[PDB]
Nucleic acid binder design. Structure first.
Lengths: 80, 80, 150, 205, 123, 129
RNA sequence: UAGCUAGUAGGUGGGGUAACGGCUCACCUAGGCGACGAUCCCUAGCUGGUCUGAGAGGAUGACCAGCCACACUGGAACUG
RNA sequence: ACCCGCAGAAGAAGCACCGGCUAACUCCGUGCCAGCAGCCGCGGUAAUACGGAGGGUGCAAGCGUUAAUCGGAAUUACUGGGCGUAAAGCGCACGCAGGCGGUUUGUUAAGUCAGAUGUGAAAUCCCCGGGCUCAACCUGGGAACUGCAUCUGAUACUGGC
């Protein structure tokens, strides 16, 4: 069954904090169904350093996808 | 729709089967071969009215033995 | 700013009779620096005289080219006694480049933006006459299109 | 390649002033200046039709203290910018941080002005810098960190900046140790003993 | 050649085969060494050359060149062999290295510090 | 026969430029009079006509224009033989787009320019450049 | 390396299996493969992708993923 | 991490090479002896090639030396194929299998193609943005893959009859 996870999604100590829609069977750094955005607190000093796709999220949250504690504060902010 | 193939009978010496020589083309555009080839196929036949030289039309049916799954639909052209 | 350029030098040594003799041959180009090219052969018993004869022939030789804007529009070939010089228009970098006997020939024609190779005989007195057969062979577009009626 | 030897000996080999071992005691007398290098040699070698440009190119490379890949970087930049490649190549080297730090007077030599950048003493836009590959923006400020302002290195370099021809394209003060790169030099602002506009026919390859 | 004569096999490619096959593609090969000999070089040049007999640790036994001057090369000392065509010896293609195992460096050397088996003394 | 009348057309004109002749004559066929109109359309010939009913013969009036020669190569693509077909989006271009490829399309024999402008694909028979 | 095949080819019906089939059995038939390279030997995991060059064309399947095959070395099974 | 101080030039430079190609070379020893080479060839009393000295050239935390595969080589050819004698034309030929032929109409719509619908995930080439100093690498937005499979049409042409 479908869930949503936060991943480092990047090279050694250079994370991008990307959020992906995936299945409960998948591994920590394994498969995922859809890449939906990024939730980075540093973002190399960017003004648009956090983003979410407002059409892809509605396809899975509305809808039975579970969300981890690591990104819920953003999904609440766009209210989706 | 169904795939249809045609070829000439090369053996009839089986109680409920016939052996057919079917014709095909090969381009192989990574070497540029451009040739005709003949494949020998075993075909199911419980009417047993084909002569060795008759041309037959065949369809995808049911597995019976090694290389035999296809069945006779009609006689197209009788020899001579 | 017309410039008189040398391509190559050759020495031919011959036993006689008793002992030896030797002469030198030079191949030079002068042209006009745009749309016209010209070359000369010169042979003498010393290099400066072989070059001097070659310049005296190169200033008295000319070929007209179908040239516009100092550049080529199409790939072209020219052939002479086993030299099969093939030329391609070169862009987005260094203009020379190309075979060692072609570099002055393109520059006295005003077309030194071209990648060229010999694809056969590397002998400079064949190569220059195969490069010039290609400058004679090229045409404008304009003329390759203007062959149509009206 | 590293020379690992006397700077005057190298400057005599290249036959020109490189802005090396500079200081208010000046050139001329007891320093072999303008003399030909080694036991035998010309004050202007006779050179081939490519070699005469290649020898001037390696003087332009060393007088601005750049590597061959860095010289080629500005050649490829000027080869896609307006008319003459050589005057634009020089306008890119002359606008580079390490030479601007020299024209501002913070180093006595171009090698010392570049040392102050690798040693992180320089600031641009109020911000600390380390890489000498930087093109200075028009009307931006070049300064030095207060922890470095008491080096005799800068007092003696600004003393020398008071004893050279005034750069007509910028402004700087020695009490603030801070100056503004107003514009690049244009036409009659700039000259050197070496040529730039004829070497526009190089490379190979 | 018709398309019917280019069937079932691509056009052949060939050669580039080892002229130093006893090394079995390795750049330096181990061998025991048994004897040293002095012999006649090519051309009327009155000079002499040295060669040795070396069985390798893979069962091949080669005739190898000795470069420079002087040697400690003896029966079962063990040394390393490489390729290196000699213009002055007929059939000689194998060469000895001084920079490995029991083989001695060249005496009185003031040139090329990395060659001929020498290493400058240090503390 | 004559087992390929297209090689009879191709050689008779290629050998005609090599003799600097003003016009050439050959036995006529429906492909020869189609290819003649494409060569007249692109300016490789001046005019063409047929004469007779018992043995209809095709006369081609040749054109060489300013400078020396009017074509470098005239090359076979499809054969009687191995035939090569392409869609409108898969049509090749000859000599940096200054040369032509000849295509029979679904409409009739024309240039690769005329075919990709008419939105057509088909058998490619010749390259002329 | 030009010849090679009695569970080798074909019929009918059970028994076991999600399910096809000499998987296996009963009673019959005499067929099958072969220069488009059968029989036999040597090399090699595959694909997305990777590498090289004037491209064309070859080569490649360390890397990060999707599959296979396998786990002292060989043969079998259970439990889920 | 990032920033600020404290010692004291302290702890920190090699390797190949100098006839000519291809950048640097003079004088002296040895005197065909002995060595040196990528190929020319050097070497018998001015050795530009060996040895040494004094200087000089290329590159630099490297510098030389090697190995395997592919290039340069159209020299295994599609693009660039070849075959009198150089190299490659069966002794003179018949002919089964394979390859293969003028021109016209009617007919079929396999392939062929025009419109329609799928696929070739992610990364990435290339193209328009962001991050680090370049080269790497990361990240926001793109693009395409003759075909194969299906459907509505056309039958100029090829196959079929």
């Amino acid at each position: 069954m479908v869930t949503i996870r936060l991943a480092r999604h990047g090279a050694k100590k250079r994370p991008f904090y990307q959020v992906v829609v995936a299945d409960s069977r998948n591994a920590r750094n394994g498969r995922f169904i859809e890449r939906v955005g990024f939730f980075n607190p540093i973002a190399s000093e960017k003004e648009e350093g956090t983003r979410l796709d407002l059409d892809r999220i509605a396809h899975w949250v509305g809808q039975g996808a579970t969300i981890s504690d690591r990104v819920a504060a953003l999904i609440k902010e766009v209210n989706k | 729709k169904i795939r249809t193939l045609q070829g000439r009978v090369v053996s009839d010496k089986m109680e409920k089967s016939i052996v057919v020589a079917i014709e095909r083309f090969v381009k192989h555009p990574i070497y540029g071969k451009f040739i005709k080839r003949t494949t020998k196929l075993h075909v199911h036949d419980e009417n047993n009215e084909c002569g060795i030289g008759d041309v037959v039309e065949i369809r995808e049916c049911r597995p019976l033995s090694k290389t035999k799954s296809w069945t006779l639909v009609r006689v197209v052209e009788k020899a001579v | 700013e017309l410039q008189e350029k040398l391509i190559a030098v050759n020495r031919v040594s011959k036993t006689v009779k008793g002992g030896r003799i030797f002469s030198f041959t030079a191949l030079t180009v002068v042209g006009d620096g745009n749309g016209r090219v010209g070359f000369g052969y010169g042979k003498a018993r010393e290099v400066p005289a072989a070059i001097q004869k070659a310049m005296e022939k190169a200033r008295r030789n000319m070929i007209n080219v179908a040239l516009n804007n100092g550049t080529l529009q199409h790939p072209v070939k020219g052939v002479h006694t086993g030299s099969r010089v093939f030329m391609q228009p070169a862009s987005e970098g260094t203009g020379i480049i190309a075979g060692g006997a072609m570099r002055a020939v393109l520059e006295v024609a005003g077309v030194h933006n071209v990648l060229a190779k010999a694809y056969g005989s590397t002998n400079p007195i064949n190569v220059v006459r195969a490069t010039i057969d290609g400058l004679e062979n090229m045409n404008s577009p304009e003329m390759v299109a203007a062959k149509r009626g009206k | 390649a590293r020379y690992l030897g006397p700077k005057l000996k190298l400057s005599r080999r290249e036959g020109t002033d490189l802005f090396l071992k500079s200081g208010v005691r000046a050139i001329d007398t007891k320093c072999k200046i303008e003399q030909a290098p080694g036991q035998h040699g010309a004050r202007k070698p006779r050179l081939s039709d490519y070699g005469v440009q290649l020898r001037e190119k390696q003087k332009v490379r060393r007088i601005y203290g750049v590597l061959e890949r860095q010289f080629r970087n500005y050649y490829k930049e000027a080869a896609r910018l307006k008319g003459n490649t050589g005057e634009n190549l020089l306008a890119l080297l002359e606008g580079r941080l390490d030479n601007v730090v020299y024209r501002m007077g913070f180093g006595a030599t171009r090698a010392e002005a570049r040392q102050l950048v690798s040693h992180k003493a320089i600031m641009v836009n109020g911000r600390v810098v380390n890489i000498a590959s930087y093109q200075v923006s028009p009307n931006d400020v070049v300064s030095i960190r207060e922890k470095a302002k008491k080096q005799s290195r800068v007092k003696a370099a600004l003393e020398l900046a008071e004893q050279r021809e005034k750069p007509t394209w910028l402004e700087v003060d020695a009490g603030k140790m801070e100056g503004t790169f107003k514009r690049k030099p244009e036409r009659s602002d700039l000259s050197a003993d070496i040529n730039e506009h004829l070497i526009v026919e190089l490379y190979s390859k | 050649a018709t398309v019917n004569q280019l069937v079932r096999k691509p056009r052949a490619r060939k050669v580039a085969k080892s002229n130093v096959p006893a090394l079995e593609a390795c750049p330096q090969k181990r061998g025991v060494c048994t004897r040293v000999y002095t012999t006649t070089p090519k051309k009327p040049n009155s000079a002499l050359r040295k060669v040795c007999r070396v069985r390798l640790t893979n069962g091949f036994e080669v005739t190898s060149y000795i470069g420079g001057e002087g040697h400690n090369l003896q029966e079962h000392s063990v040394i390393l062999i490489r390729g290196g065509r000699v213009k002055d010896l007929p059939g000689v293609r194998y060469h000895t290295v001084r920079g490995a195992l029991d083989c001695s460096g060249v005496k009185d050397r003031k040139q090329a510090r990395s060659k001929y088996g020498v290493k400058r003394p240090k503390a | 026969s004559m087992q390929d009348p297209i090689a009879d057309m191709l050689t008779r004109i290629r050998n005609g430029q090599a003799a600097n002749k003003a016009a050439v004559t050959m036995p006529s066929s429906k492909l020869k009079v189609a290819i003649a109109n494409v060569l007249k359309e692109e300016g490789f010939i001046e005019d063409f006509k047929v004469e007779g009913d018992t043995k209809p013969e095709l006369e081609l009036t040749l054109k060489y224009f300013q400078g020396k020669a009017v074509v470098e190569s005239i090359q076979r693509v499809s054969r009687p033989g191995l035939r090569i077909y392409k869609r409108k989006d898969e049509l090749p271009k000859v000599m940096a787009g200054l040369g032509i490829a000849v295509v029979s399309t679904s409409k009739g024999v024309m240039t690769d320019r005329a075919a990709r402008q008419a939105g057509l694909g088909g058998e490619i028979i010749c390259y002329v450049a």
